[PDB]
Design a protein around this ligand. Structure first.
Ligand SMILES: C[S@@+](CC[C@H](N)C(=O)[O-])C[C@H]1O[C@@H](n2cnc3c(N)ncnc32)[C@H](O)[C@@H]1O
Ligand SMILES: [Mg+2]
Ligand SMILES: [Mg+2]
Ligand SMILES: [Mg+2]
Ligand SMILES: [Mg+2]
Ligand SMILES: [Mg+2]
Ligand SMILES: [Mg+2]
Ligand SMILES: [Mg+2]
Ligand SMILES: [Mg+2]
Ligand SMILES: [Mg+2]
Ligand SMILES: [Mg+2]
Ligand SMILES: [Mg+2]
Ligand SMILES: [Mg+2]
Ligand SMILES: [Mg+2]
Ligand SMILES: [Mg+2]
Ligand SMILES: [Mg+2]
Ligand SMILES: [Mg+2]
Ligand SMILES: [Mg+2]
Ligand SMILES: [Mg+2]
Ligand SMILES: [Mg+2]
Ligand SMILES: [Mg+2]
Ligand SMILES: [Mg+2]
Ligand SMILES: [Mg+2]
Ligand SMILES: [Mg+2]
Ligand SMILES: [Mg+2]
Ligand SMILES: [Mg+2]
Ligand SMILES: [Mg+2]
Ligand SMILES: [Mg+2]
Ligand SMILES: [Mg+2]
Ligand SMILES: [Mg+2]
Ligand SMILES: [Mg+2]
Ligand SMILES: [Mg+2]
Ligand SMILES: [Mg+2]
Ligand SMILES: [Mg+2]
Ligand SMILES: [Mg+2]
Ligand SMILES: [Mg+2]
Ligand SMILES: [Mg+2]
Ligand SMILES: [Mg+2]
Ligand SMILES: [Mg+2]
Ligand SMILES: [Mg+2]
Ligand SMILES: [Mg+2]
Ligand SMILES: [Mg+2]
Ligand SMILES: [Mg+2]
Ligand SMILES: [Mg+2]
Lengths: 17, 344, 95, 237, 85
RNA sequence: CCUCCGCAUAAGCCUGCGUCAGAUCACUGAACUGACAAUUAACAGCCCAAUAUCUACAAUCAACCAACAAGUCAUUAUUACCCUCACUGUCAACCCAACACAGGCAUGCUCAUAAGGAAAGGUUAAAAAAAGUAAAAGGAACUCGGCAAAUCUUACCCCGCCUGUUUACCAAAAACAUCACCUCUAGCAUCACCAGUAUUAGAGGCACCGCCUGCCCAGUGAUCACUUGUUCCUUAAAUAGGGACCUGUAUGAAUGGCUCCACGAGGGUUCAGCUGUCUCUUACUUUUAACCAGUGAAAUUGACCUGCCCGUGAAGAGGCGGGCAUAACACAGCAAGACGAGAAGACCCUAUGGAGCUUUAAUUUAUUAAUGCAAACACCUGCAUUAAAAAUUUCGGUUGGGGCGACCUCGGAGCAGAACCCAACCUCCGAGCAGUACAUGCUAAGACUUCACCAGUCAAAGCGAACCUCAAUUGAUCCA
RNA sequence: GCUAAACCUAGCCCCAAACCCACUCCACCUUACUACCACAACCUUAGCCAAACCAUUUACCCAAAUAAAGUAUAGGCGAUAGAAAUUGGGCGCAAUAGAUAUAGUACCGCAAGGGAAAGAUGAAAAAACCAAGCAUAAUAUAGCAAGGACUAACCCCUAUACCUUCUGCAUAAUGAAUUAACUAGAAAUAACUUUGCAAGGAGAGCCAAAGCUAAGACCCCCGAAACCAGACGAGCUACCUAAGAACAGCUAAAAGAGCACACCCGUCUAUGUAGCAAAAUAGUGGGAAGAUUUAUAGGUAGAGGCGACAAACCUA
C-alpha cells in the first residue's frame, strides 16, 4: 500500500549552453 | 445470502438423531422399562417363518419342526379356550434364548416360495381381525406387505383391497404377491391393487367393508435407528413430523367411514410414541362422533394378551388396545394394535 | 494439431483419427457405431443390427477428418484383396 | 563460518583461562540452542576429575592438603584447590571441606572396607556398601562423569564378584567395575536449588535469554485414530 | 543416477533415484610388483580377477575403458615397465 | 540581538569561499571557469628471534566493612642477538539523507562562553489561517470524552503482580516476556548443548508471593480367612473343577477458585480547584496575507465564444425544448455546482487467475530414523515394511435476507384450445425395473427423429422355422 | 520576428571467405594494481508453458543437403512425440534507424546489477519560405463554435464534440493539453483463378479413373499477480560474538529504588500533508546504574536467517 518515487536521470538538468 | 455463521449446529448422523429423540421422550414414558427396550432395539430383530398355504405346507411344517422351531399360533389356539382368532395361519418361531436365524426362503415344487420371513409381532393384528369366510377386507396401507400376505393366507377373504400412496412401494408389494400367491387366486378383482390417497377412501367408498386393517405411517422406530438413508428423523425432513400426527387421524377415519355398521377395524402402529398410539385413536373417534356423528366402541384385548403371554411380552400400562415391547429373550418389532367396531 | 513440426516443419496427422476411421479415395469416410460392443443383453435385435453396420460421415465431419490427416492417407492404394475395393470410386453421380 | 573454538589449551594449568561465549551458535554460525546470550564474562578453571593421578615419576596412594574452597562461575558445585608433593590442581569440593583439611587418594582395593571418611577417593571395591559417593567413572582411568553437580550423591547398592551397582541421583542403576574410583560424600553447595532468582535481570546475568513469544498447542502429536473407530473421536455435542 | 515411477506404473509420481554399488576393502598381491595392496573393490572386480586367474592378469588383459580407474592404469603402467625393462 | 553550541580527535569525504585573471534574488561577482600555490613529525599509524616454562587470591580513593553476576592488564631458564630514526596520514566552510535539506551522527574539553552566530528584501496593517498575551460576571453550562489551555487535586472500579518488550511509517495495550510454580525428554566426552553431568541440560505450559481445592491402590470378615480378578492344569468342549499369582510399591492437578501490597503515558467513574472549553466573544503582537522589486514550481487540461427557471433525459443539463436575462475588461474573497482534482480501490461478483496457512483433500516417500530379509564377513550396498518430516496439486455448477439446505439425468402431473415447437423459474408425482418368450434368428427396399453431432425409432420383400407387455426403466471413448 | 526547421556521414546489420588476440620498464590473489619469510576441481537441471484444470505426459545441436515420412512406432492410445534400413556481395539502416555504444562512459544501486543522450559551414576560417508556442495585433449581448447566407465580421435561421464498451446514451462510462517522430495480420490443408503439358504430369523420391506442374491470393499489438535456476545482499534492521565507552545534581538502608540533566524512546495535542522531512516540527510526556544506551570489527541468507510472536525485521 506504498508507492516509491522515481527520479529522472540527472544528465538532462545539467545541460549547458 | 450470508455465507458465514457464528455457530453452526453439529452434524449428527440421522440414526443418532433418532436415538436422541427416543432418549429424551421414551425415558419419561417407560421409566425403568426403557433400558431393556433400548438394548433390544439396538440388538438384532428375531424373525418368524410364515408358511405359504398355497405351497406344500405340510412338508415345510415338517422341515421347520426338524430345525427345532415351533408354530406359536397353533399352541396359542390350544390354550385359547382356557369373536374368534384368524384361522389357517402358520408362522414358526424359535423358542426364547434361541437366537438362530431361519434359512432364507427358496422356491418350492409348485414354483412359489415355501415360507415368508417376517416379525411375528406384525402377524398379531391379522389375528386380531375376526375373519370369517366371505368377508370383504380393506387394507389402507398395504405396501410393502407382510400383513397383506397373511390376510391372503387366511383364505377367508372374498375380495382384497390393497392401497398405498407410493407406487415405488406398491411395486415391491406387486412383486411379492405375484411370487408368493399364484395367479389362480388373483383372478378378477378378488385382489384389487390401487395406488391412491388413503384419505379419499372415506368419501370414495362407504359402508363397503366388514373388515379393515389400518397400518398408518409411523416413525419406524427400529428402522430409524438402523437405516441411515431416507430417515424420517433426518433434520431436513423435520417438517414432515409436524404434519405426521394429523395424517394418522385422517387415515384411521377413512377406514371408519368405509366400514360396514358393526364392521371391525383394527389399527396398528410400528412405534411406541404415545402421541401416535392413543392420542391418534381418541382424536379420530372424537372427530367422527362430533362432525359426522357415528358411534364407535373399542374392545379390550386383555383376553388376547393372556394367550400370547408365553410367546410375547406386553406393556401393561396401555389404556386401550395392546402394545408389544422388544425384549432380548423374545425379540419382536415394537408395535401397537387395537380393535374397534362402529356401533352404528 | 501440429501445423509445423519442430524437426521437419511439416504437418502432422492425428493418429486418433487413423485408428477409428477409413477414408475412401472418392472423399467419403467410414466409421463404426458407438457402443456396438456395449451391454448387448438389454438391446433389441434390430437395435443390435443397426449397431453392427459401417456408416458414412456427413460433410463437416468429413472436412474435419481431412484436415486432421495428411495427404499420404488420401492417395490411391492398390491392395491385393481389400474388401473395400469397389467403394473407392463413385457411379452415376450427377452433383 | 570463521569460527574457532576457545578450547585450544593443551597444558594443564591452575590459572583462570578466558572463555568465549557461543550464543548457541555452531561452527556453521546458525543458532542450534535457544535462550543463550551474553551475561557476565567468565574465566574457566580447569578441573582434574581424574582424582587418582600420581605425580610425574611417582606411584602409589598419595595425599593432598586443601588450601582454598572458592566459588566457580562455570558450575554449580564449589571447587577446592589442593596441593601435594609439588603439584597444585582444582578439584570438586564435598560438603565439609574447609581450608587446611587433608585428603587421601588411593587405588588400593582392601579385603576389608576402608575408612568411610569424606572427601577422600577410593576404588568402589574398597568402599563399603550403602555409602554416599560422588564423581564416579564408568570405566577405569576414564575420569568422573556422573555425580558431579551441587549437592548430588549416589550410593553403592551391591558389590558382587567384580561388579558394582551404583544408583545415580535419577534413582537409576548403573554397572561399573571395582577398579574404578569414587570420592566419598555429597557435593558442595547444597540448597543450590533453594536459591531464588529474584527478577528477570538475574537470569539475563547468568547468560540466559527469554523463552519465545510464540504459542504452542502441544509438543506431542495426538494418538492416531484407527479405521474401526473414527466416529468415536471428536463426537460433537 | 536416474528417475523412477513410484510403483512400476507410469501413471504414478516420478522420483529421483541413485543406485550405488556395494564396496569392500580387500587385499591383493601383485607378482610382478611383488607388493601387497589394500584397495576398495566390488564383487564384480573380484569375479573378474577370478576369471582372469590373478590380479596381474586382470590388470594386464583389461583395456583402459573397462578398468575405469586411474590407479588401475598406474598398476598397469608399472607392470608393463617392469616387463619391458 | 541569539547561542543545547563551540574547539579538537575519531569515522566519513577528497582540494570542495587561498592568490591572480576572464566570466556571469543580488554585486557584473563568486561557493563559476582556468592558471598558480599548499598539508614539513616530536602526535598518530606501521612492531617484536626460538624452544620449554610460569601466571589461585577482582574493580570500586582499596583502607574498615560488604558482597555477587566472580571479574581488562605479571614470567623464569637457556640459546641467538650490536646496525638507527626509513615509510604513510597532516588542507577546507567537509559526512549519511536526490538539494547550501527544521532530519541522522561516537568520544574529550568548555556548561556558557575568551568560541560561534543573525529571526526582519521594501511597504501596508483587509478577510480567512497559524502561534502567542490579556479579559467583566459566571466556572464544564462545551464536549463522545475537561481534548486543549490551564493548573500543577481526592477517593475508587476493571484488567495486567511489578522493571521490561512489541507492529521502523495509522495500534504501546488488557498482547509478549517475567521472578515463582508445573509437564515432558535425556545416564552422557574433545566444534553447539559443554571443556557441562539429574540440586544438570533441552523442549513446553502458566505467570510472583498468600490460602482453599488431590485419588477407579479389591471387597467383606479383621496383620489374618473367604469372595473376586489374572494366569495356567483340566474339560470333546462348556454347566466347572483343580493348582499358581496379586503386601520387595503408595497416591495424585503442564487441575480450578478467592483475597491482598506495590506499580501502569492502560480503560471507566468521582471530590476540590482551575481556567475563553462554553454562555458569548473581544483586543493587541508575531507569522501569514495584500501591494512594489528579483527569482520562479506542481497536480490538472477533448475543444470551449463556459448564464438563470421550468420541463425532458425515469434519477442526472452551461450546451436538448419553452421562457427569462444579457456592452467589454482586471483585482480581492467564498466554497453551493462543474457526479471538481489525486491516489497500490472500501464493498459484491467473476476468472476451469495467483499466493500464505491448516488438515481426517488427492497423489507420493525423493530425505531422515527404526525394523526385517539378502550381500559381506560393527559399518556399507540392494530389497521390503513402519513412522517422522516434507513435496506437488485442487477446492464443479444452479438456487437460497434471519440459516443449520434443496437440487444437477429420464418420464408425467397445473399451465398446453386445432400441423410441429413453446407457460420460464418454481411446487409436486414417479424411473434406475419387473414379468413372458427363447427364430429377443439372419438379411434387406424406403422412411421417422427431441430442433447440431452422437445417440434413438419404424419397416416391405427375401433365406430358415411355426401352424411380447410396459410412460421413463438409462451411460460414449480409452482401458481391464 | 523569435523559438525553431532543414541536412549526410560517422558507423552499423546480414552473408561469404578465413580457424583468433593474447603484447616496452614497474606493479598487481594481503585491503588487487602493495619489492623483501615455516586448504583445494569433477556430482540426473528445474520450472514457465501445452493439455483450454491438473497429477503420467508436453519439440529443444549433436555432426550429408533431398527423399524414405509425419511412415513404422510411442502416448492420461490425448495433447502431442517420432525413427531407421535405404537413397544421395546486398529490391540492407542512415542519428528516435542501424549495435546499448561518441560508451559499458556519465549517471543509478552496498553489491550482483541497470544504463543514457547527442553531431552537421565552406575548396579554404592563415576568408529567402514551412510544426506546435508565441510576437507583429486583448476584448463587445447569444451559447460543440460551424453551416445556409449576406452589401456587410457579428446580429437572422438550422445544428445534443470524437473514440471505445453496452440494446438505448443525448450524457452515463473509459481515453485524449498540443505538435513532430515512432508504434500493431506473420502460415498450412483443401478449394478458386491464370498458365504449360496431358492419360499422363514433375529437372529421381510423389500424385494420377483428367490429372499433374507453376504462380497468384488467407491467419495482429501492448499489459499481470506468479513459478523455477544461478548469483548478490546483515554499512538499515533482528539476534549473537570479540574487545571497548557513557550515565551531572538531589533524596535514599540502599534496591531491574524515587525526583531529575545529558542520552534513549515516542503518550497526547496542534502544525505539516509534492512537506524542512518518502514520517518532520513545537509543546507535553515514558525510562534515565540497567533485561540500560552507544562507537568499532566479525557472524547467521531466502525450500533460509532472525524473532521478550507484532506474521515483526532481513538496505525507504
Ligand atoms: C407403516 S407402512 C404399512 C405397514 C406395512 N405395509 C405392513 O403391513 O407391515 C404405511 C405406508 O403407507 C404409505 N402412505 C403414505 N401416505 C399414505 C396415504 N395417504 N395413504 C396410504 N398410504 C400412505 C407410506 O409410504 C408407508 O410406507
Ligand atoms: Mg520458561
Ligand atoms: Mg508463551
Ligand atoms: Mg611517536
Ligand atoms: Mg564572536
Ligand atoms: Mg536573515
Ligand atoms: Mg516580506
Ligand atoms: Mg481573523
Ligand atoms: Mg473571565
Ligand atoms: Mg455537559
Ligand atoms: Mg451539551
Ligand atoms: Mg490534558
Ligand atoms: Mg504490566
Ligand atoms: Mg506503527
Ligand atoms: Mg521500536
Ligand atoms: Mg503509536
Ligand atoms: Mg500473558
Ligand atoms: Mg512499564
Ligand atoms: Mg492567496
Ligand atoms: Mg512578485
Ligand atoms: Mg503536478
Ligand atoms: Mg433539471
Ligand atoms: Mg458540461
Ligand atoms: Mg476570482
Ligand atoms: Mg480491484
Ligand atoms: Mg487455478
Ligand atoms: Mg460460477
Ligand atoms: Mg406439465
Ligand atoms: Mg434431428
Ligand atoms: Mg423374408
Ligand atoms: Mg494447462
Ligand atoms: Mg489458452
Ligand atoms: Mg542510436
Ligand atoms: Mg541507444
Ligand atoms: Mg507556426
Ligand atoms: Mg443562435
Ligand atoms: Mg468486455
Ligand atoms: Mg461521465
Ligand atoms: Mg552489524
Ligand atoms: Mg528485540
Ligand atoms: Mg530507576
Ligand atoms: Mg524514574
Ligand atoms: Mg498474535
Ligand atoms: Mg493475526
Amino acid at each position: 500500500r506504498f508507492t516509491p518515487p522515481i527520479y529522472q536521470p540527472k544528465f538532462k538538468t545539467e545541460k549547458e549552453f | 445470502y450470508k455465507k458465514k455463521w457464528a455457530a453452526t449446529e453439529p452434524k449428527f448422523p440421522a440414526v443418532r438423531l433418532a436415538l436422541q429423540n427416543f432418549d429424551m421422550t421414551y425415558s419419561v414414558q417407560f421409566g425403568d422399562l426403557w433400558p431393556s427396550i433400548r438394548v433390544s432395539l439396538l440388538s438384532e430383530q428375531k424373525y418368524g417363518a410364515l408358511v405359504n398355504n398355497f405351497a406344500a405346507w405340510d412338508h415345510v411344517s415338517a422341515k421347520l419342526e426338524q430345525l427345532s422351531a415351533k408354530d406359536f399360533v397353533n399352541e396359542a389356539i390350544s390354550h385359547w379356550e382356557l369373536w374368534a382368532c384368524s384361522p389357517n395361519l402358520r408362522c414358526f418361531t424359535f423358542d426364547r434364548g434361541d437366537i438362530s436365524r431361519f434359512p432364507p426362503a427358496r422356491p418350492g415344487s409348485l414354483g412359489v416360495m415355501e415360507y415368508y420371513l417376517m416379525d411375528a409381532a406384525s402377524l398379531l393384528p391379522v389375528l386380531a381381525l375376526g375373519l370369517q369366510p366371505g368377508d370383504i377386507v380393506l387394507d389402507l396401507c398395504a405396501a410393502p406387505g407382510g400383513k397383506t400376505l397373511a390376510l391372503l393366507q387366511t383364505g377367508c377373504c372374498r375380495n382384497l383391497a390393497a392401497n398405498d400412496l407410493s407406487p415405488s412401494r406398491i411395486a415391491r408389494l406387486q412383486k411379492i404377491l405375484h411370487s408368493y400367491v399364484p395367479e389362480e387366486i388373483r383372478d378378477g378383482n378378488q385382489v384389487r391393487v390401487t395406488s391412491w390417497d388413503g384419505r379419499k377412501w372415506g368419501e370414495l367408498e362407504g359402508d363397503t367393508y366388514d373388515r379393515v386393517l389400518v397400518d398408518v405411517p409411523c416413525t419406524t422406530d427400529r428402522h430409524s435407528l438402523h437405516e441411515e438413508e431416507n430417515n424420517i428423523f433426518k433434520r431436513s425432513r423435520k417438517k414432515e413430523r409436524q404434519i405426521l400426527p394429523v395424517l394418522q387421524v385422517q387415515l384411521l377415519a377413512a377406514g371408519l367411514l368405509a366400514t360396514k355398521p358393526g364392521g371391525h377395524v383394527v389399527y396398528s402402529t410400528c412405534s411406541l410414541s404415545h402421541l401416535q398410539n392413543e392420542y391418534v385413536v381418541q382424536g379420530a373417534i372424537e372427530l367422527l362422533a362430533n362432525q359426522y356423528s357415528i358411534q364407535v366402541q373399542v374392545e379390550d384385548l386383555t383376553h388376547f394378551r393372556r394367550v400370547f403371554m408365553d410367546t410375547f411380552c406386553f406393556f401393561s400400562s396401555c389404556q386401550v388396545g395392546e402394545l408389544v415391547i422388544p425384549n432380548l429373550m423374545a425379540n419382536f418389532g415394537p408395535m401397537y394394535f387395537c380393535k374397534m367396531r362402529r356401533l352404528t | 494439431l501440429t501445423y509445423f513440426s519442430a524437426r521437419k516443419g511439416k504437418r502432422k496427422t492425428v493418429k486418433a483419427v487413423i485408428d477409428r476411421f477409413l477414408r475412401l479415395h472418392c472423399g467419403l469416410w467410414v466409421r463404426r457405431k458407438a457402443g456396438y460392443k456395449k451391454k448387448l443383453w438389454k438391446k433389441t435385435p434390430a437395435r443390435k443390427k443397426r449397431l453392427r453396420e459401417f456408416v458414412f460421415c456427413n460433410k463437416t465431419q468429413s472436412k474435419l477428418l481431412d484436415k486432421m490427416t495428411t495427404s499420404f492417407w488420401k492417395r490411391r492404394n492398390w491392395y491385393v484383396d481389400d474388401p473395400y475395393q469397389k467403394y473407392h470410386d463413385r457411379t452415376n453421380l450427377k452433383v | 563460518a570463521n569460527f574457532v573454538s576457545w578450547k585450544s589449551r593443551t597444558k594443564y594449568t591452575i590459572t583462570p583461562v578466558k572463555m568465549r561465549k557461543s550464543g548457541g551458535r555452531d561452527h556453521t554460525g546458525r543458532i542450534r540452542v535457544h535462550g543463550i546470550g551474553g551475561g557476565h564474562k567468565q574465566r574457566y578453571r580447569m578441573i582434574d576429575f581424574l582424582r587418582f593421578r600420581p605425580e610425574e615419576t611417582k606411584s602409589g596412594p598419595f595425599e593432598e592438603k586443601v588450601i582454598q574452597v572458592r566459588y566457580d562461575p562455570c558450575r554449580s558445585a564449589d571447587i577446592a584447590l589442593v596441593a601435594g608433593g609439588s603439584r597444585k590442581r582444582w578439584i570438586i569440593a564435598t560438603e565439609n571441606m574447609q581450608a587446611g583439611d587433608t585428603i587421601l587418594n588411593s587405588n588400593h582395593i582392601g579385603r576389608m572396607a576402608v575408612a568411610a571418611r569424606e572427601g577422600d577417593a577410593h576404588p568402589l571395591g574398597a568402599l563399603p556398601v550403602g555409602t554416599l559417593i560422588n564423581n564416579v567413572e564408568s570405566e577405569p582411568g576414564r575420569g568422573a562423569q556422573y555425580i558431579r553437580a551441587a549437592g548430588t550423591c549416589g550410593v553403592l547398592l551391591r558389590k558382587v564378584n567384580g561388579t558394582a551397582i551404583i544408583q545415580l541421583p535419577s534413582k537409576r542403576q548403573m554397572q561399573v567395575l571395582e577398579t574404578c574410583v569414587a570420592t566419598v560424600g555429597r557435593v558442595s553447595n547444597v540448597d543450590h536449588n533453594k536459591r531464588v532468582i529474584g527478577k528477570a535481570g538475574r537470569n539475563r546475568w547468568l547468560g540466559k535469554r527469554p523463552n519465545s513469544g510464540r504459542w504452542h498447542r502441544k509438543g506431542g502429536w495426538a494418538g492416531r485414530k484407527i479405521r474401526p473407530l473414527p466416529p468415536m473421536k471428536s463426537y460433537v455435542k | 543416477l536416474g528417475q523412477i515411477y513410484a510403483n512400476n506404473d507410469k501413471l504414478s509420481k516420478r522420483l529421483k533415484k541413485v543406485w550405488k554399488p556395494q564396496l569392500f576393502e580387500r587385499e591383493f598381491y601383485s607378482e610382478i610388483l611383488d607388493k601387497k595392496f589394500t584397495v576398495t573393490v566390488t564383487m564384480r572386480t573380484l569375479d573378474l580377477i577370478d576369471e582372469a586367474y590373478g590380479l596381474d592378469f586382470y590388470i594386464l588383459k583389461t583395456p583402459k575403458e573397462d578398468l575405469c580407474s586411474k590407479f588401475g592404469m598406474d598398476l598397469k603402467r608399472g607392470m608393463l615397465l617392469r616387463l619391458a625393462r
